[PDB]
UniProtKB/Swiss-Prot annotation, chain B:
Domain S4 RNA-binding per the UniProt entry, residue ranges: 95-155
CDD domains tied to this protein: S4
Matching InterPro entries: Ribosomal_uS4 (IPR022801), Ribosomal_uS4_bac-type (IPR005709), Ribosomal_uS4_CS (IPR018079), Ribosomal_uS4_N (IPR001912), S4_RNA-bd (IPR002942), S4_RNA-bd_sf (IPR036986)
Protein name in the entry: Small ribosomal subunit protein uS4
Domain of life: Bacteria
GO CC entries: cytoplasm; cytosol; cytosolic small ribosomal subunit; small ribosomal subunit
Swiss-Prot record, chain D:
Domain notes: The N-terminal domain interacts with the head of the 30S subunit; the C-terminal domain interacts with the body and contacts protein uS4. The interaction surface between uS4 and uS5 is involved in control of translational fidelity.
Gene3D superfamilies reported in the protein's UniProt record: 3.30.160.20, 3.30.230.10
Miscellaneous comment as given in the Swiss-Prot or TrEMBL entry: Altered uS5 proteins have been identified in a number of mutants. Some mutations in uS5 have been shown to increase translational error frequencies.
Cited function: With uS4 and uS12 plays an important role in translational accuracy. Many suppressors of streptomycin-dependent mutants of protein uS12 are found in this protein, some but not all of which decrease translational accuracy (ram, ribosomal ambiguity mutations).
One Gene Ontology term, aspect cellular component: cytosolic small ribosomal subunit
Domain S5 DRBM: start-end pairs: 2-65
Pfam families assigned: Ribosomal_S5, Ribosomal_S5_C
GO BP terms in the entry: cytoplasmic translation; maintenance of translational fidelity; response to antibiotic; ribosomal small subunit assembly; translation
Annotated effect of mutating R11L: In strain: SPCR9; spectinomycin resistant. Not a ram mutation
InterPro entries per the UniProt record, alphabetical: Ribosomal_Su5_D2-typ_SF, Ribosomal_uS5, Ribosomal_uS5_bac-type, Ribosomal_uS5_C, Ribosomal_uS5_N, Ribosomal_uS5_N_CS, Ribsml_uS5_D2-typ_fold_subgr
Organism classification: Bacteria, Pseudomonadati, Pseudomonadota, Gammaproteobacteria, Enterobacterales
This protein's name: Small ribosomal subunit protein uS5
Organism: Escherichia coli (strain K12)
UniProtKB/Swiss-Prot annotation, chain E:
Organism of derivation: Escherichia coli (strain K12)
Gene designation per UniProt: rpsP
Subunit (UniProt): Part of the 30S ribosomal subunit.
Superkingdom as given in the UniProt entry: Bacteria
Keyword terms of this UniProt record: Endonuclease, Hydrolase, Nuclease, Ribonucleoprotein, Ribosomal protein
Alphabetical list of NCBIfam families matching this protein: S16 (TIGR00002)
Pfam families in the record: Ribosomal_S16
Protein name: Small ribosomal subunit protein bS16
GO cellular component: cytoplasm; cytosolic small ribosomal subunit; small ribosomal subunit
Curated annotation (Swiss-Prot), chain F:
Protein's organism: Escherichia coli (strain K12)
Alphabetical list of PROSITE patterns matching this protein: RIBOSOMAL_S12
Lineage: Bacteria, Pseudomonadati, Pseudomonadota, Gammaproteobacteria, Enterobacterales
GO molecular function: misfolded RNA binding; rRNA binding; structural constituent of ribosome; tRNA binding
Sequence positions bearing N6-acetyllysine: K107
Annotated protein name in UniProt: Small ribosomal subunit protein uS12
GO cellular component, one term: cytosol
Role: With S4 and S5 plays an important role in translational accuracy. Interacts with and stabilizes bases of the 16S rRNA that are involved in tRNA selection in the A site and with the mRNA backbone. Located at the interface of the 30S and 50S subunits, it traverses the body of the 30S subunit contacting proteins on the other side and probably holding the rRNA structure together. The combined cluster of proteins S8, S12 and S17 appears to hold together the shoulder and platform of the 30S subunit.
Residues spanning the signal sequence: none
Miscellaneous note of the record: At least 19 substitutions or deletions in 11 codons can promote streptomycin resistance, dependence or pseudodependence; all but one of the streptomycin resistant mutations (K42R) are associated with hyperaccurate translation and thus reduced translational efficiency.
Keyword terms, alphabetized: Acetylation, Antibiotic resistance, Methylation, Ribonucleoprotein, Ribosomal protein, RNA-binding, rRNA-binding, tRNA-binding
Chain positions found as 3-methylthioaspartic acid: D88
Length: 80, 205, 129, 150, 82, 123
RNA sequence: UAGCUAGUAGGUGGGGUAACGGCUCACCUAGGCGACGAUCCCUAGCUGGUCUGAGAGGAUGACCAGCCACACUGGAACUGA
RNA sequence: CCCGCAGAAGAAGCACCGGCUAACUCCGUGCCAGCAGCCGCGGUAAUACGGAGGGUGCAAGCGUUAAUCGGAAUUACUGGGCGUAAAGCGCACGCAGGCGGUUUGUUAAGUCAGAUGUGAAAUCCCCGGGCUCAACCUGGGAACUGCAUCUGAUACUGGCAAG
């Protein structure tokens, strides 16, 4: 359940894993202005049924691999 | 210390009697009210917009016999306590066991009183007190030590206590030589034309 | 304008009264009126008419007193790429309460007063005064 | 209760054919405890002969302010020439907090307790009126509902 | 070995201890879970002057709060049953 | 400027140059005195003032001034650098504290004795 | 300093830890990181907090307290919770 | 800590006074001696060097140096400028990035509201106690912009659908 995130499966050239850059917002701690950010994670997909250009929610969990601590939960959007 | 030097020579650098040495004559000759505060009495000391707050300083200051630092600590806090920081300052300068004890007939000159308190010869609200810079809150049971009620100082002093514009913010019966600070000396009743619209600036830089 | 609308609105009025103009005009929009109410119903304008069921038109009838204008101190704030948001303990208070700041709270847009009165924050807008 | 206090007295000069001359300049303002203010400015070949002209022109041609109890009310801010000034309402107790001109031009303008500061140049003959400019906009809390309400 | 011991926090000569539930191998008065009452060694009869939060005491002893002597004495010294 | 124009490269403080290199937080350092001389002032002034090139403990050899009338400062005579520059003397960004280590304080100076070096006149 | 990285990024099975994991090994895929600034160079123990300041902000991390690291230098394991 | 015992007795110094800056005179010197934070002082009548007289300011301390912030809105979100004072690329196209006319529906991420954990204690601050006061010690509360979570709000912003 956690919270997940409809990140972007920017990468998939891996096996059972996919690099995903999550978009994020935040006010500047000084000038104050909503700015976009990124959260590139190494998700896990045993069946590898995600795909690039797609959109999916990622959830954190047991440290699967050195950097990979998240797994695929669902594929909201996809296609290209 | 507290100047410990010539009182008149210091009163000249101000003019308006700063109390201190009294209980007799003073003023009009025997002092030289702004006649020669030093040597250039003639040469007009045309102060600046700054000279005021600064010259004012010595008055609300030396008149009570205090140092330069001890004063700041007072003023700084004189702002913390909610309310008009201005007068809120004179109050503390009043509750001081110095002027308090003094303003009740005891001792001719505040300094003459500072000695009494310092020498255990003073008592307040039961327990004895020998520290001048003691914030004497109202309602206290002030009174000279019965271990010296009849000495001389307080005697030849309590006499002029009458001439001293009878304080209202308090009630002191020269009788058994006791008194109690009724309530805060509301600026007005504080018989003084002194200007405080500077004390708040010179220390607000 | 060719980017931010509301920005022009607040201007149009401040400009008009600047030169004792009758009443400037601009293409009406839902948000434009929500900010308009807080003008006529908040003492700042006579009233606003409409024109065009598809191509509307706002009509802020400016005002002036003795020998000067009424709404003589208006400015935008939560402009794009700089939008401002604040909580109840942060709510504005235009010119020491003497002025007003349109605030788009979750419960419709309304003057600074209705903000605290209703107890809530909202997208601060201009500083009418 | 017309209060009058000097602001500044520079010398100012000018060169000419034979040699060069001078015309001392005097800056002064005027006002009453109530809340009126009326500055001025004059000059002459002597400190006094000029100081008087300045005041006279000052005591004349003046404007009033909606001065409150003793301080101000809303955020006052008047500008003029090369100088920006800001004045804030200092609650009772905090005496007049100002530097040069902006100071003297207030202890007579009625305002007793207020803390303000400038931004631009410190030029006196410019900072003075710069303060008045603020007063110029200092409207009162009342009357507003009149211009707007009904 | 958590327990409710005493920790000196008063000025020199005029000590003002502070009972708190902390670890056994903990420093003088550093690392600590939660301060349960105190104890002011003076006098002059000022109504009170040495609370203790009795109810909090038990909250931990349930496990293994090795409440030291002095502190344990506090429970008694103060109206534990009143 | 523009908010975003900053987000790229926010404003920055201009690192002030410590007009006192042979400082290193040290309010003063000992010396060695490589040599002492008598140079001339800038341009608007005259008179040959007294200066000295003392070598600091950190090998930061520099030159200092010798305030006050007269001085016993010889050559190998060690001194304690004070700091503070001068005007007529170019480069000289330090002064020798009189009445300390080897350098003796002024002579017969019955005024502002704290400077230089003169412990009470005679009481 | 504009490129950087093979146990490198991930996957299988052995092995291993108190326990997840290239932690390690064999094999397989050829990834992974980077201008939202990697890699490299200089510097620095981190925080509560401290100083200054109207505030925002700037400077700082001594003594008190929490955390981390270090114990002649480099290296290693033994006992044991 | 309290009592008593002689006896003013044993207990003042430092800096500054040309302008910023409170506080002036007289001598000696003569671009020499030297002063100097800045502007600048001195080449026979120095309030600026040195001494004295005096005064001004601090106080068991005073002054000099070193160091941070302040002033400095002088890196400026608050809170700045770019015709000539420093400052518009020689000019276009355009990726990323930033920004987005208008109406409705939907979403509820930005945002607003309330609840909850949590943001150690101690500094700080409000009130109030304990040292004769104060320094200091100490009770309670506030506060800890924060982080996340739960449930709501839907005006604006963002997403989707329809234009
Ligand atoms: Mg004119
Ligand atoms: Mg300037
Ligand atoms: Mg210096
Ligand atoms: Mg494995
Ligand atoms: Mg180090
Ligand atoms: Mg500031
Ligand atoms: Mg070793
Ligand atoms: Mg002067
Ligand atoms: Mg000198
Ligand atoms: Mg002479
Ligand atoms: Mg700044
Ligand atoms: Mg500029
Ligand atoms: Mg140019
Ligand atoms: Mg061009
Ligand atoms: Mg805290
Ligand atoms: Mg929408």
């Amino acid at each position: 359940k956690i919270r997940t995130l409809q990140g972007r499966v920017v990468s998939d050239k891996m096996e059972k894993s996919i690099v995903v850059a999550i978009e994020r917002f935040v006010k500047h701690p000084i000038y104050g202005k909503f700015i976009k950010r990124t959260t590139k994670l190494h998700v896990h997909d045993e069946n590898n049924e995600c795909g690039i250009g797609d959109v999916v929610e990622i959830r954190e969990c047991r440290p699967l691999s050195k950097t990979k601590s998240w797994t695929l939960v669902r594929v909201v959007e996809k296609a290209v | 210390a507290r100047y410990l030097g010539p009182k008149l020579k210091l009163s000249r650098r101000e003019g308006t009697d700063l109390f201190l040495k009294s209980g007799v004559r003073a003023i009009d000759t025997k002092c030289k009210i702004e006649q020669a505060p030093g040597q250039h009495g003639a040469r007009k000391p045309r102060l600046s917009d700054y000279g005021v707050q600064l010259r004012e300083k010595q008055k609300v200051r030396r008149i009570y016999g205090v140092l330069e630092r001890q004063f700041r600590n007072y003023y700084k806090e004189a702002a913390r306590l909610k309310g008009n920081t201005g007068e809120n300052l004179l109050a503390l300068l009043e509750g001081r066991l110095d002027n308090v004890v003094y303003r009740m007939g005891f001792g001719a000159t505040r300094a003459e009183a500072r000695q009494l308190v310092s020498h255990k010869a003073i008592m307040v609200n039961g327990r004895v007190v020998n520290i001048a810079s003691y914030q004497v809150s109202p309602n206290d049971v002030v009174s000279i030590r019965e271990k010296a009620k009849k000495q001389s100082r307080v005697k030849a002093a309590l006499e002029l206590a009458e001439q001293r514009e009878k304080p209202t913010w308090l009630e002191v019966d020269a009788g058994k030589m006791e008194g109690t600070f009724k309530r805060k000396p509301e600026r007005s009743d504080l018989s003084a034309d002194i200007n405080e619209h500077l004390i708040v600036e010179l220390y607000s830089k | 304008s060719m980017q931010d609308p509301i920005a022009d609105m607040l201007t149009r009025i401040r400009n008009g009264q600047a030169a004792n103009k009758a009443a400037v005009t601009m293409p009406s929009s839902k948000l434009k009126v929500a900010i308009a109410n807080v003008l006529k119903e908040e003492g700042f304008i006579e009233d606003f008419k409409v024109e065009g069921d598809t191509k509307p038109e706002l009509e802020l009838t400016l005002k002036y007193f003795q020998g000067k204008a009424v709404v003589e101190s208006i400015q935008r704030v939560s402009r794009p790429g700089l939008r401002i948001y604040k909580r109840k303990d942060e709510l504005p208070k235009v010119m020491a309460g003497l002025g007003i700041a349109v605030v788009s709270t979750s419960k419709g847009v309304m003057t600074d007063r209705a903000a605290r009165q209703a107890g809530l924050g909202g997208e601060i807008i201009c500083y009418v005064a | 209760e017309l209060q009058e206090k000097l602001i500044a007295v520079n010398r100012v000069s000018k060169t000419v054919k034979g040699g060069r001359i001078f015309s001392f300049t005097a800056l002064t303002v005027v006002g009453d405890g109530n809340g009126r203010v009326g500055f001025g400015y004059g000059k002459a070949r002597e400190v006094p002969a000029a100081i008087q002209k300045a005041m006279e022109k000052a005591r004349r041609n003046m404007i009033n302010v909606a001065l409150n109890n003793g301080t101000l009310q809303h955020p006052v801010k008047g500008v003029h020439t090369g100088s920006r000034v800001f004045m804030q309402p200092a609650s009772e107790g905090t005496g007049i907090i100002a530097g040069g001109a902006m100071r003297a031009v207030l202890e007579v303008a009625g305002v007793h307790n207020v803390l303000a500061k400038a931004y631009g140049s410190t030029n006196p003959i410019n900072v003075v009126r710069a303060t008045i400019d603020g007063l110029e906009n200092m409207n009162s809390p009342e009357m507003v509902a009149a211009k707007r309400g009904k | 070995m958590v327990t409710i011991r005493l920790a000196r926090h008063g000025a020199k000569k005029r000590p003002f201890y502070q009972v708190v539930v902390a670890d056994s191998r903990n420093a003088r008065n550093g690392r600590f879970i939660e301060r349960v009452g105190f104890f002011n060694p003076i006098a002059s009869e000022k109504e009170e002057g040495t609370r203790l939060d009795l109810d909090r005491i038990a909250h931990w002893v349930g496990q293994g709060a090795t409440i030291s002597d002095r502190v344990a004495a506090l429970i008694k010294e103060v109206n534990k049953a009143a | 400027a523009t908010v975003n124009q900053l987000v790229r490269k926010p404003r920055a403080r201009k690192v002030a140059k410590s007009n006192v290199p042979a400082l290193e937080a040290c309010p003063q350092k000992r010396g060695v005195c490589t040599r002492v001389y008598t140079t001339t002032p800038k341009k608007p002034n005259s008179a040959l003032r007294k200066v000295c090139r003392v070598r600091l403990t950190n090998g930061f050899e520099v030159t200092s001034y010798i305030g006050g009338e007269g001085h016993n400062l010889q050559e190998h005579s060690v001194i304690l650098i004070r700091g503070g520059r001068v005007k007529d003397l170019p480069g000289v960004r330090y002064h020798t504290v009189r009445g300390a280590l080897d350098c003796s304080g002024v002579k017969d100076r019955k005024q502002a004795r704290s400077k230089y070096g003169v412990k009470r006149p005679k009481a």
